[PDB]
Design a protein around this nucleic acid. Structure first.
Length: 36
DNA sequence: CAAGGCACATGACAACGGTGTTCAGTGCCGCGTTGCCCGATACCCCCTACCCGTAGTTGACTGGCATCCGGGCGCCGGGTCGCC
């Protein structure tokens, strides 16, 4: 909550885990599992 | 010298002259009042050309932007953390 709201948006992104190959392929696997 | 007899004209008398009205009828000859006739005009159709919205496009590609000062000037008013 500050002026120039884009800065607060970038902070709201914060620190989140970037996904390496096996990570996102497994994530997609259980994504389609939940899909079915 | 007075009374009685004939001429011309005279108080009315209608009826023509000529011309102005009358109700009357029927037209005379200009406006209209209406049936056509067309002519244009709105209003259905078919065709395709083009405007506009939706949906894909797979090497990889992971945090931006330039702010802002030489007001100036004062006050309000609140916040804000030291203070003892």
């Amino acid at each position: 909550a500050t002026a120039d709201p884009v800065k607060d948006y970038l902070k709201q992104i914060g620190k989140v885990p970037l996904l390496n190959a096996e990570q996102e392929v497994e994530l997609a696997k259980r994504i389609e599992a939940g899909l079915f």
